[PDB]
CSV table of C-alpha atoms in Angstrom, one decimal:
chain,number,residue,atom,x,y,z
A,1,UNK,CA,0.0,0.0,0.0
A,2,UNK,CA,0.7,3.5,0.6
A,3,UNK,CA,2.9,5.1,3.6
A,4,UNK,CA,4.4,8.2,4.8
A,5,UNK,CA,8.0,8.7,6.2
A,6,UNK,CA,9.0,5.3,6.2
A,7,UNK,CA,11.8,4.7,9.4
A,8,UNK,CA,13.8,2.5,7.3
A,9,UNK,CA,17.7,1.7,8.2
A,10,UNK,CA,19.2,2.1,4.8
A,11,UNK,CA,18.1,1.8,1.6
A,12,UNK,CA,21.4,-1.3,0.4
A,13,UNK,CA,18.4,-3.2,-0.6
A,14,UNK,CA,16.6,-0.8,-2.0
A,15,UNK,CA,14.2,-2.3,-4.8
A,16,UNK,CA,15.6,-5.9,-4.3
A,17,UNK,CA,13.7,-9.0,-4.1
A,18,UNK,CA,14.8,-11.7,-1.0
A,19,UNK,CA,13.2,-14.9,-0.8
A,20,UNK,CA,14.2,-17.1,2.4
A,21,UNK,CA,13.1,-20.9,2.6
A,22,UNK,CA,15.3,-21.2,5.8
A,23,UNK,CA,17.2,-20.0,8.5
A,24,UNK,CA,19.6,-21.0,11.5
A,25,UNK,CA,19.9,-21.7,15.4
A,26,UNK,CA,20.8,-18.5,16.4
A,27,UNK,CA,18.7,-16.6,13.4
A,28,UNK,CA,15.2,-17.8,12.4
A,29,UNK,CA,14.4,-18.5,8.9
A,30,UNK,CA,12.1,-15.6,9.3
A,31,UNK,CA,14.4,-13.8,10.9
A,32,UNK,CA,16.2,-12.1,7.9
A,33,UNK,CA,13.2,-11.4,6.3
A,34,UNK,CA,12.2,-8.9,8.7
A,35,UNK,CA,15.4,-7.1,8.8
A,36,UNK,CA,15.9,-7.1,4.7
A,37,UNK,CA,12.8,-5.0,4.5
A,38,UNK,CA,13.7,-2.6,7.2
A,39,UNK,CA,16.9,-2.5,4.9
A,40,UNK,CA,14.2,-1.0,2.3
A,41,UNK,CA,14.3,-5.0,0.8
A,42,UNK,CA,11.7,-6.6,-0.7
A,43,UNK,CA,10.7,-10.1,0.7
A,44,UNK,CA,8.4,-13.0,-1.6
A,45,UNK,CA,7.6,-16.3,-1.2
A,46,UNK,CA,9.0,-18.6,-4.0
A,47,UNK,CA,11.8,-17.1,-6.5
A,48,UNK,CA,11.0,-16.1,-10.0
A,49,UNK,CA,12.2,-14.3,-13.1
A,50,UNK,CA,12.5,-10.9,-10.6
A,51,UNK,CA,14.0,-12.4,-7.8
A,52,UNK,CA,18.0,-11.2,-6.4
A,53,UNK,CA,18.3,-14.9,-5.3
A,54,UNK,CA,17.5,-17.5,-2.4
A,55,UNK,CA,18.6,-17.4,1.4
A,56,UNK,CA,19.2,-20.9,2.8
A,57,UNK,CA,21.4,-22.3,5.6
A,58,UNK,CA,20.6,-25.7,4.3
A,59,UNK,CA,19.1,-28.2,2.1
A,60,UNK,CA,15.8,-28.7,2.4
A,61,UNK,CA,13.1,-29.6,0.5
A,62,UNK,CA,11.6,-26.3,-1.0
A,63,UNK,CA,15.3,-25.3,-1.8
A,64,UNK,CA,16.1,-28.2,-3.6
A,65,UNK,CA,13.6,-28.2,-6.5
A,66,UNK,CA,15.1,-24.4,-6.7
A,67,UNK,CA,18.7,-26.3,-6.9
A,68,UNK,CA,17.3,-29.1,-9.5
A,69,UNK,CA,16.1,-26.5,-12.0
A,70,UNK,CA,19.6,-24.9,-12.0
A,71,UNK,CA,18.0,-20.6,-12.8
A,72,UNK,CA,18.8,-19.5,-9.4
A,73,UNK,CA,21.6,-19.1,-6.9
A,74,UNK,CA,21.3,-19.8,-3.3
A,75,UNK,CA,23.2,-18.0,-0.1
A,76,UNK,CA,23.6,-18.4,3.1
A,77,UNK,CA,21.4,-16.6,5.8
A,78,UNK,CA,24.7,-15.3,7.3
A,79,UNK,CA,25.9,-13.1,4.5
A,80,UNK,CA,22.8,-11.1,5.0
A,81,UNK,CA,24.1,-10.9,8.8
A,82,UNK,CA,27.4,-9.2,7.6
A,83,UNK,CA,25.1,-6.3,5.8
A,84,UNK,CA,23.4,-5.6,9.2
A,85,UNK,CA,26.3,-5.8,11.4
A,86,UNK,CA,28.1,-3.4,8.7
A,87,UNK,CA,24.7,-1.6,7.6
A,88,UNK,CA,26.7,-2.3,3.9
A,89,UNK,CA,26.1,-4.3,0.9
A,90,UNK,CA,29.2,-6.9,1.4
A,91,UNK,CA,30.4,-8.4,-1.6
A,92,UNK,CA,29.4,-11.7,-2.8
A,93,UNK,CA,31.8,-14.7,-1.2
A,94,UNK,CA,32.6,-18.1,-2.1
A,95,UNK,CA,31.7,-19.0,1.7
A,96,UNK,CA,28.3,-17.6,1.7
A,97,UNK,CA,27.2,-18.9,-1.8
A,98,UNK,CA,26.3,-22.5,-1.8
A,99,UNK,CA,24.8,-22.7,-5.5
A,100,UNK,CA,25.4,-20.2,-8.8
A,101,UNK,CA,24.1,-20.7,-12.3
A,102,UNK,CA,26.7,-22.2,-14.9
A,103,UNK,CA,26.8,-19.0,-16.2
A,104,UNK,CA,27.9,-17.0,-12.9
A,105,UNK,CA,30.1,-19.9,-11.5
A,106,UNK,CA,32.5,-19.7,-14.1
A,107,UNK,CA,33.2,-16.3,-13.4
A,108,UNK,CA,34.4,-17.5,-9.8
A,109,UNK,CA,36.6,-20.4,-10.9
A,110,UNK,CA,38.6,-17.9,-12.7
A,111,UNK,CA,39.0,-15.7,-9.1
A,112,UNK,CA,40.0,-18.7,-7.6
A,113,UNK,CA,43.0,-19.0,-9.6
């Protein structure tokens, strides 16, 4: 809907899609998804053609048939922590990512070199 002088904390996320399927111990799976949109983020339910990517700490079964059809990328819940702690959008890491497209993998196994 509508709304006035929103009290967000930044705007990092600012018009980007999150969509969590689950979280950690010490972080909920919903968890994140209130913070992102206080970070001006946007927060669905399932992933599609205008969705950033997928927050998982683990396989389960909703993330997997995202991992079987091989479009999107999942991350870890943490990475998200890092922007909070730092208020910042931290760069992608091979520690946080724990699936990327054939197309966007490549570019990594290059950096890894």
């Amino acid at each position: 809907g509508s709304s006035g002088s929103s009290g967000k904390i930044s705007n990092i996320f600012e018009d980007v899609e999150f969509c969590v399927m689950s979280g950690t111990d010490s972080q909920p799976k919903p968890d994140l998804e209130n913070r992102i949109a206080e970070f001006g983020g946007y927060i669905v339910q399932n992933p599609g053609p205008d969705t950033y990517c997928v927050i998982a700490g683990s396989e389960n079964i909703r993330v997997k048939n995202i991992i079987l059809s091989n479009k999107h990328d999942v991350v870890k819940p943490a990475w998200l922590l890092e922007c909070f702690k730092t208020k910042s959008f931290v760069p992608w890491q091979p520690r946080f990512m724990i699936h990327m497209c054939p197309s966007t993998k490549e570019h990594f196994a290059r950096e890894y070199d």
